[PDB]
Design a protein around this ligand. Structure first.
Ligand code: HEC
Ligand code: HEC
Ligand code: HEC
Ligand code: HEC
Ligand code: MOO
Length: 107
């Protein structure tokens, strides 16, 4: 399938983020849209039964906060864990890519 246009809003929370597929088009679709039950899975992350727990303290697979903000990952990358690798030791990239505010995720 085809990546959607840029400027997509992730707005399940009071701290929404703009996701641009163009900034991520060197990654395989399934790197984020991981298959579920052996079928292609393009459903929104916080779909009921999926990543639908919004408690930030929740560490279960259902935590919406975890799958985005976890600094470490193994099987599927988080937003954070990949960006921490890309920013690395770099000062400005850490700011743009990994910061909690004044970043490109959370301006
Ligand atoms: C981009 C890679 C991000 C960085 C860097 C940080 N966060 Fe984030 N955040 C991101 C997304 C995609 C979302 C969900 C957007 C939506 O509304 O659908 C969030 C949301 C949050 C929230 C609200 C969570 C909730 O209310 O359930 C918080 C409190 C939050 N983010 C905090 C946070 C902190 C503390 C960070 C620094 C360590 C940080 N974010 C970075 C994406 C990204
Ligand atoms: C990780 C960095 C991703 C890669 C690589 C690709 N996509 Fe994606 N996509 C990603 C996120 C965080 C979201 C928002 C989901 C949400 O819960 O809001 C999306 C969204 C889509 C959608 C849905 C668009 C809509 O109008 O709801 C589609 C159809 C989609 N993405 C397709 C897609 C394809 C085909 C990709 C490979 C070429 C691809 N994406 C890459 C994260 C990531
Ligand atoms: C419901 C059918 C889901 C949707 C839609 C999305 N995910 Fe998911 N996720 C789901 C399951 C059943 C699992 C179990 C483990 C597996 O690899 O199948 C996961 C796992 C993840 C993880 C790893 C979490 C962990 O505990 O280490 C991540 C980081 C993740 N998923 C991300 C993710 C994103 C970004 C999604 C939207 C684009 C998304 N998932 C959709 C169930 C479902
Ligand atoms: C690695 C596999 C990544 C994952 C998973 C996510 N992102 Fe990412 N992102 C990645 C790189 C290497 C870059 C720099 C490339 C560039 O074109 O600048 C980015 C960039 C962003 C940005 C900044 C630019 C922009 O599109 O506004 C944002 C806001 C961003 N990425 C958000 C984001 C979110 C919310 C993710 C989780 C769903 C996520 N990215 C995953 C690498 C990777
Ligand atoms: O944006 Mo919230 O009210 O911490 O789930």
């Amino acid at each position: 399938a085809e990546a959607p246009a840029d400027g997509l809003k992730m707005e399940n929370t009071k701290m929404p983020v703009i996701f641009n597929h163009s900034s991520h088009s060197s990654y395989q679709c399934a790197d984020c849209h991981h298959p579920v039950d052996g079928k292609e899975n393009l459903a929104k992350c916080a779909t009921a039964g999926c990543h639908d727990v919004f408690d930030k303290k929740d560490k279960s697979v259902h935590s919406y906060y975890k799958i985005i903000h976890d600094r470490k990952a193994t099987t599927v990358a988080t937003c954070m864990s990949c960006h921490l690798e890309a920013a690395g030791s770099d000062k400005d990239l850490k700011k743009e890519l990994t910061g909690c505010k004044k970043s490109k995720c959370h301006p």
